[PDB]
Short mmCIF file of C-alpha atoms and ligand atoms in Angstrom, two decimals:
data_model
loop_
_atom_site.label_atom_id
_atom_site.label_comp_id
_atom_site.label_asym_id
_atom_site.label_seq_id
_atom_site.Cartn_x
_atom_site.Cartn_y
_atom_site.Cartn_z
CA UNK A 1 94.45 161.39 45.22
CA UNK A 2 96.57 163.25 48.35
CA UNK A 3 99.51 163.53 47.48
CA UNK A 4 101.15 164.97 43.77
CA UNK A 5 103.63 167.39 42.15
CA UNK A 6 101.76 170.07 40.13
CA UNK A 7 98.90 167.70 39.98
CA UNK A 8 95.70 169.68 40.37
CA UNK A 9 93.66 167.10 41.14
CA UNK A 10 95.03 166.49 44.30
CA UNK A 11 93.41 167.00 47.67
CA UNK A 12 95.18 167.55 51.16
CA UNK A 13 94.64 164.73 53.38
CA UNK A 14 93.54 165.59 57.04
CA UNK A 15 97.15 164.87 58.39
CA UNK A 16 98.96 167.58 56.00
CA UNK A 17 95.88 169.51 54.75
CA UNK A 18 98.43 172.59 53.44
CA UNK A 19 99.63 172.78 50.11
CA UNK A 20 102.72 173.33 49.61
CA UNK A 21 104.16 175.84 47.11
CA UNK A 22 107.75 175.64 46.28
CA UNK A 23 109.96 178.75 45.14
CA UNK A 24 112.61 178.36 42.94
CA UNK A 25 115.76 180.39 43.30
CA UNK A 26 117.71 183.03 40.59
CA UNK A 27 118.31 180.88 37.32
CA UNK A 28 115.88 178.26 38.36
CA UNK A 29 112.92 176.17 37.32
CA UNK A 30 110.29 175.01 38.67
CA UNK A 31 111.55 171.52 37.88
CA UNK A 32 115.14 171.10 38.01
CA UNK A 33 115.41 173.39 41.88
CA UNK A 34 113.24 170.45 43.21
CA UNK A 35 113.94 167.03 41.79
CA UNK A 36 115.06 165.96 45.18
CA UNK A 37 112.39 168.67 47.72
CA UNK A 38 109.67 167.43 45.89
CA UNK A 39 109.60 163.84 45.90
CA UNK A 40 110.72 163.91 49.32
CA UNK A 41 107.67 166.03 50.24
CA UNK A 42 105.35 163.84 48.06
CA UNK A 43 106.55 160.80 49.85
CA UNK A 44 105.52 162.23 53.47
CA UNK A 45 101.72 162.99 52.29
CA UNK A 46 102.22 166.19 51.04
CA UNK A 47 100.34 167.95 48.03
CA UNK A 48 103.24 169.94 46.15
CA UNK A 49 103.34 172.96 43.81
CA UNK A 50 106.30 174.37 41.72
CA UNK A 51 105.91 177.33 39.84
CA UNK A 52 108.09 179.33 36.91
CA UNK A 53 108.45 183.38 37.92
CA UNK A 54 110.37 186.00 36.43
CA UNK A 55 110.79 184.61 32.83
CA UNK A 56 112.52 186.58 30.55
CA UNK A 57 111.38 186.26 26.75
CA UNK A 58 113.41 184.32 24.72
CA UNK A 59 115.72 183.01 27.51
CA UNK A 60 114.40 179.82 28.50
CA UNK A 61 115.09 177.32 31.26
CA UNK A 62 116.49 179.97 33.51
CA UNK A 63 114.05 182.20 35.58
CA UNK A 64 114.13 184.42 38.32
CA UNK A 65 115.40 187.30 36.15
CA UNK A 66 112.55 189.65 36.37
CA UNK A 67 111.86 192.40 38.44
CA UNK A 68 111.01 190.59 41.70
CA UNK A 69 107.80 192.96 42.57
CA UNK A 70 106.59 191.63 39.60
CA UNK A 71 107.77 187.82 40.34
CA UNK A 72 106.14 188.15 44.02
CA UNK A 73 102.67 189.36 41.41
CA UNK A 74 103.20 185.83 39.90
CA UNK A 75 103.48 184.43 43.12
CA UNK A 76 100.11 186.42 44.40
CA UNK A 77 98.34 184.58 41.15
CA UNK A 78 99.79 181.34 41.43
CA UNK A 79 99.38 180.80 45.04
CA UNK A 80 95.27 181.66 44.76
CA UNK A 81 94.99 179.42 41.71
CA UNK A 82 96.46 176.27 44.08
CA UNK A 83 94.05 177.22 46.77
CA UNK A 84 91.14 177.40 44.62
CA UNK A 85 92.02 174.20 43.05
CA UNK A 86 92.52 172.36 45.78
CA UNK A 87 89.62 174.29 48.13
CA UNK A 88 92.32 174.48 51.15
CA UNK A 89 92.60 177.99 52.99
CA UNK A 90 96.06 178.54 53.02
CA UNK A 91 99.52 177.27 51.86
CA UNK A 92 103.05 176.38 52.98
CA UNK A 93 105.74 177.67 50.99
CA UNK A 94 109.51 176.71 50.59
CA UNK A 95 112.13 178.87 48.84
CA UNK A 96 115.63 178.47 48.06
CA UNK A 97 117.77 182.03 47.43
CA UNK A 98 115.57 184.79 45.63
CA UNK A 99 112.95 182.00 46.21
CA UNK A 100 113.03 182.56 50.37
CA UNK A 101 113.11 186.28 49.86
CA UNK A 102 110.36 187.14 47.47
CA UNK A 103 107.29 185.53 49.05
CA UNK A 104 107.95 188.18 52.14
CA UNK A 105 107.42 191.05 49.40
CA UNK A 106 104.20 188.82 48.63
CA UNK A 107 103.47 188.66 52.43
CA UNK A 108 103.61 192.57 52.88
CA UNK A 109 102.41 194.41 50.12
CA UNK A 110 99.81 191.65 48.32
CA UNK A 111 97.48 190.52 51.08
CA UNK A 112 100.02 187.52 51.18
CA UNK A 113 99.38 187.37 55.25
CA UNK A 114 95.86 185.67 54.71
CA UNK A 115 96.81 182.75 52.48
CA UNK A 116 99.92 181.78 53.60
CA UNK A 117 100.34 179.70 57.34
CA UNK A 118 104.44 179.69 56.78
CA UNK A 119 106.96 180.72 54.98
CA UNK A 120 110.54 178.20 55.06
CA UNK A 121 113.26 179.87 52.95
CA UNK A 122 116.37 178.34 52.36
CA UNK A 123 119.42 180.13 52.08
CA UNK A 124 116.81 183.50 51.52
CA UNK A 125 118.92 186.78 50.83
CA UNK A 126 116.21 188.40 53.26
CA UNK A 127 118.35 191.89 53.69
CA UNK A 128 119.82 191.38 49.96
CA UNK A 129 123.02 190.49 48.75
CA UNK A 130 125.54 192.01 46.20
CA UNK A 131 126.41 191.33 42.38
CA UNK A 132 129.50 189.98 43.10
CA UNK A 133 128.14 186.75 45.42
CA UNK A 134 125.04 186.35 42.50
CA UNK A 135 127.88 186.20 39.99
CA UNK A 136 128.99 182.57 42.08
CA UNK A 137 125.59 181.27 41.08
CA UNK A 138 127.17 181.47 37.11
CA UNK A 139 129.43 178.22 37.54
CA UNK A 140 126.24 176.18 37.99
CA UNK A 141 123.99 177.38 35.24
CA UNK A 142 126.40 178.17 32.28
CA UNK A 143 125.05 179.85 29.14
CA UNK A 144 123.00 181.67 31.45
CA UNK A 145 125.75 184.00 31.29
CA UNK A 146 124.71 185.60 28.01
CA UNK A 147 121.33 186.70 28.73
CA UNK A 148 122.24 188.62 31.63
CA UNK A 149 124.24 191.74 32.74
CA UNK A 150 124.73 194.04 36.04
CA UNK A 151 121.37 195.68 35.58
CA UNK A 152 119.19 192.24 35.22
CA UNK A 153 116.02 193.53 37.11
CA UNK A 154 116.22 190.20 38.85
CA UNK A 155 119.89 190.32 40.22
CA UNK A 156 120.05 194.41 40.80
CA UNK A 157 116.84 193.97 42.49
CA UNK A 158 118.69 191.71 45.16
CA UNK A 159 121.36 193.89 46.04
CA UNK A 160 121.29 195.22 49.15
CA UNK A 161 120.40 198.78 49.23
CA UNK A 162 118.60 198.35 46.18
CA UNK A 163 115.02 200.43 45.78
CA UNK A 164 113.24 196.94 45.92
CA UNK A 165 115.42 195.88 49.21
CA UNK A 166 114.83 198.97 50.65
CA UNK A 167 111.02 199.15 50.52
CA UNK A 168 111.03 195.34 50.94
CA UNK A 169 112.47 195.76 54.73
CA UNK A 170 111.99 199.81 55.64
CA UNK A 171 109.50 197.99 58.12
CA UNK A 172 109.76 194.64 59.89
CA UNK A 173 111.35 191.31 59.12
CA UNK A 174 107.52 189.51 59.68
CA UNK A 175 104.02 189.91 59.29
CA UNK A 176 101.50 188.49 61.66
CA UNK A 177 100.34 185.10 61.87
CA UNK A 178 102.97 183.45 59.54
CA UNK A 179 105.29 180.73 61.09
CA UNK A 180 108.64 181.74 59.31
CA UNK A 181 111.74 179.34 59.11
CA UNK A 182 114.89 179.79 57.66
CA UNK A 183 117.78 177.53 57.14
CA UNK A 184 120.97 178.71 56.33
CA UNK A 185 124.10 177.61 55.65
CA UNK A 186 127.97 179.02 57.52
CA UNK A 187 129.61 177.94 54.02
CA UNK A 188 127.34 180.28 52.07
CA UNK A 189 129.71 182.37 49.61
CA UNK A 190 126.56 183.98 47.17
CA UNK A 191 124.73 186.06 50.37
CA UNK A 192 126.96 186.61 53.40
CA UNK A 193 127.49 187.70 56.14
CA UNK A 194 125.00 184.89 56.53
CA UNK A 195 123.37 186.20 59.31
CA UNK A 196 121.87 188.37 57.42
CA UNK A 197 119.37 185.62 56.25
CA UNK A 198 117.75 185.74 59.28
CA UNK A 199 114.44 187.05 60.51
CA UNK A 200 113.66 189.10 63.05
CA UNK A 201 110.49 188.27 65.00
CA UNK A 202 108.47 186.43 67.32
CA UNK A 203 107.44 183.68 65.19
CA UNK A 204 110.94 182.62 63.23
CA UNK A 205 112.97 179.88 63.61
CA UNK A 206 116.45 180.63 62.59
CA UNK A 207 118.82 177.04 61.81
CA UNK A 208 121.92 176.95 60.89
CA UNK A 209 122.61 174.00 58.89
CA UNK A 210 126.22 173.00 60.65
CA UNK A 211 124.41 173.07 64.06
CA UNK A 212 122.20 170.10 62.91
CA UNK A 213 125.17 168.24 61.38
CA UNK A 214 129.03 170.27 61.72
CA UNK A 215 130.30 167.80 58.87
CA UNK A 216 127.41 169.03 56.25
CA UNK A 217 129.21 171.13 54.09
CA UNK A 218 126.81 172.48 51.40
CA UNK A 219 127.22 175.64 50.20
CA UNK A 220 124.38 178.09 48.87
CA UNK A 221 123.23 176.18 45.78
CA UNK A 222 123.70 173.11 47.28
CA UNK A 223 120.78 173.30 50.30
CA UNK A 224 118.23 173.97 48.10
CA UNK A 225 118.60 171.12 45.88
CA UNK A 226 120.45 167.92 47.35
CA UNK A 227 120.61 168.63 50.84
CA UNK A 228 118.79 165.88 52.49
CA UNK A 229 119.50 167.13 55.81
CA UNK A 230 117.98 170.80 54.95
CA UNK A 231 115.31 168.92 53.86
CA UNK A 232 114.61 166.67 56.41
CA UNK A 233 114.41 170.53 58.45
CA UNK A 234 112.05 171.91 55.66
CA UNK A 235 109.28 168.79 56.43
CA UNK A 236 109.97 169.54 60.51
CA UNK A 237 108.47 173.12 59.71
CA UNK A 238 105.92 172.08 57.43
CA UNK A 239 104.39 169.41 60.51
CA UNK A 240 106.00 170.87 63.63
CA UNK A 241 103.58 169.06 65.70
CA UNK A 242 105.29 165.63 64.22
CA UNK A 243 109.12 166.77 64.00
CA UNK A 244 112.03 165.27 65.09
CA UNK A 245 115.88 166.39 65.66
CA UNK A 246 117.20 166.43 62.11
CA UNK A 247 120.83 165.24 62.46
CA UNK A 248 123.93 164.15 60.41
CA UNK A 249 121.80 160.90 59.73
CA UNK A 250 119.21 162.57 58.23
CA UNK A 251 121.74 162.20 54.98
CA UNK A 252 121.43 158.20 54.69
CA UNK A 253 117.69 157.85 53.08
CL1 CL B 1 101.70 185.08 35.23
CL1 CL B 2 136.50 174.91 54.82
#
């Protein structure tokens, strides 16, 4: 068996012999953020991962609420238990919002570097973000509205000039020897300026979504769940060696 979603059985084949982990976003699952990603990535010979982070007791379904030192910690244990299952040295990983932006805390402060060949974050709020734009998140996952407040560890952890943002980028955007790529979208209205997504350093790929098709429209939640075109981008980074120009065809499957 090569190729699976959460199946821990399976084994990389020789032609995508990277795991890859995938990163849910704030509110998310490790289900429901990749009901399109992962299938699509199982389909193309990869061996996928999902994982739950930042649960908060007695709120279930939507995750990402915790304090995100802590949810990059989950990360850190998840991330060794899928290379130890499947014997591979290191893993890919894909995030979508918080999900793009948290592995990087992983990356610099839990030995992340060494396990890890690149990072792809979708949409990552990478410099933070502010209340306001997580509050246009709420739309999409009512009745997560009652769990929360403005001092959620998961959403004032996020905003920019937050103790967490801070230490996350006092240094540099990247860490050696990690391919980074991140895809954003001009349309974004939950981290803007959208710029700010970006990565600074020698090994990132920035992409803007409208530059590979002007007519996609998506908007923040919407790249990291349906966008077949972001995806189509996410699988060009994860086998760079076998990409090709994702375009406004890329939509038709
Ligand atoms: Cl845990
Ligand atoms: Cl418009």
């Amino acid at each position: 068996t090569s190729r699976g979603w959460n199946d821990y059985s399976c084994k990389p084949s020789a032609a995508h012999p990277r795991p890859v982990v995938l990163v849910h976003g704030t509110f998310g699952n490790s289900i429901d953020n990749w009901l399109v990603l992962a299938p699509y990535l199982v389909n193309r010979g990869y061996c996928v991962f999902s994982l739950d982070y930042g649960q908060l007791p007695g709120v279930p379904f939507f995750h990402g609420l915790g304090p995100i030192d802590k949810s990059a910690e989950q990360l850190d244990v998840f991330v060794d238990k899928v290379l130890d299952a499947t014997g591979a040295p290191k893993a890919d990983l894909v995030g979508h919002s918080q999900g793009g932006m948290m592995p990087n805390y992983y990356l610099k402060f839990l030995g992340g570097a060494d396990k890890v060949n690149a990072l792809v974050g979708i949409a990552p709020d990478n410099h933070g973000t502010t209340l306001l734009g997580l509050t246009k998140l709420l739309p999409f996952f009512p009745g997560v509205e009652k769990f929360i407040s403005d001092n959620t560890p998961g959403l004032a952890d996020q905003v920019a000039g937050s103790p967490f943002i801070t230490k996350l980028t006092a240094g540099g955007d990247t860490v050696p020897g990690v391919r980074y790529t991140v895809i954003a979208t001009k349309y974004d209205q939950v981290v803007t300026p959208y710029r700010t997504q970006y990565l600074d350093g020698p090994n990132v790929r920035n992409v803007l979504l409208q530059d590979l098709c002007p007519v996609d429209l998506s908007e923040h939640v919407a790249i990291g769940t349906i966008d077949r075109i972001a995806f189509h981008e996410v699988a060009n980074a994860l086998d760079p060696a076998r990409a090709t120009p994702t375009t406004c065809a890329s939509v038709i499957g």
